[PDB]
């Protein structure tokens, strides 16, 4: 039981130096490059789960300078800024931002977190979570997939605690801007649950020797991403759920 990503260069390397951190059991397990990763569903009957994307900025710090010079004008995004509402530039509408814009309506800037989507034991799937932002929606959904089990829920709570202990040691998240990657949650009606960090595509090391917070916030060369804000939210809110 494995799966194969499409080998990307930040997320090779950000696997072959995971596998060597403290952080190796909250990651899909790494198995060379015959991308040969775990599947994180193979031990579920039937897989119920919930992609969180964690963070406070969802794009790289560098990829909106490499966005001063040239422009990245995909008209489908901008399709997208005007369907959900008008909030879009004359300029725009007749002619990065797409994503600070999703971050707003979404809940990345209160709570550096986002729920991406959802799979059901057969509810087949859902990616309709672009405007849930409030605490209370984001609970709302949660409280849903979960449907009442109370033993998944402390299950994913006690795991959420130690992986945030995880990365608060760990010196490889440490020194990395860490961006676009996910929490998974997985379970089943058998009441088995599991947490694990994927999605390594952005990630990137710092200066010589230099390190980030994580929780502070973001400003034009901080590389600060909030991952932890997001990660201590994200907690607050199953707890309150527990209730
Ligand atoms: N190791 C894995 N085991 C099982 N399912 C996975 C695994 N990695 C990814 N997935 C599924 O693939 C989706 C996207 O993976 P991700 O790394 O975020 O890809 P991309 O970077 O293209 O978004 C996840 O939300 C999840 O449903």
């Known amino acids: 039981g494995l799966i194969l990503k499409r080998s990307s260069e930040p997320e090779h390397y950000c696997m072959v130096r995971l596998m060597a951190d403290v952080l190796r059991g909250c990651v899909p397990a790494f198995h060379g490059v015959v991308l040969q990763l775990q599947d994180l569903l193979d031990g579920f009957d039937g897989p119920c789960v919930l992609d969180c994307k964690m963070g406070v900025r969802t794009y790289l710090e560098e990829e909106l300078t490499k966005a001063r010079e040239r422009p990245k004008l995909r008209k489908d995004m901008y399709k997208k800024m005007l369907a959900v509402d008008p909030e879009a530039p004359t300029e725009e509408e007749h002619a990065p931002r797409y994503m600070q814009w999703r971050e707003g309506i979404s809940s990345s800037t209160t709570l550096g977190?986002?729920?991406?989507?959802?799979?059901?034991?057969?509810?087949?799937?859902?990616?309709?979570?672009?405007?849930t932002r409030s605490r209370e929606q984001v609970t709302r959904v949660f409280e849903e997939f979960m449907q009442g089990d109370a033993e998944v829920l402390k299950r994913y709570l006690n795991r959420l605690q130690q992986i945030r202990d995880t990365l608060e040691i760990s010196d490889f998240?440490?020194?990395?801007?860490?961006?676009?990657?996910?929490?998974?949650?997985?379970?089943?009606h058998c009441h088995r649950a599991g947490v694990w960090l994927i999605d390594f595509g952005k990630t990137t090391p710092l200066p010589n020797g230099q390190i980030l917070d994580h929780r502070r916030p973001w400003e034009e060369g901080n590389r600060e991403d909030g991952y932890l804000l997001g990660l201590d939210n994200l907690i607050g809110i199953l707890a309150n759920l527990a209730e």
């Open 113 to 131: 977190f986002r729920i991406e989507g959802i799979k059901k034991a057969d509810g087949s799937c859902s990616t309709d979570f672009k405007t």
């Open 173 to 188: 998240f440490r020194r990395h801007e860490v961006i676009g990657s996910s929490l998974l949650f997985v379970h089943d």
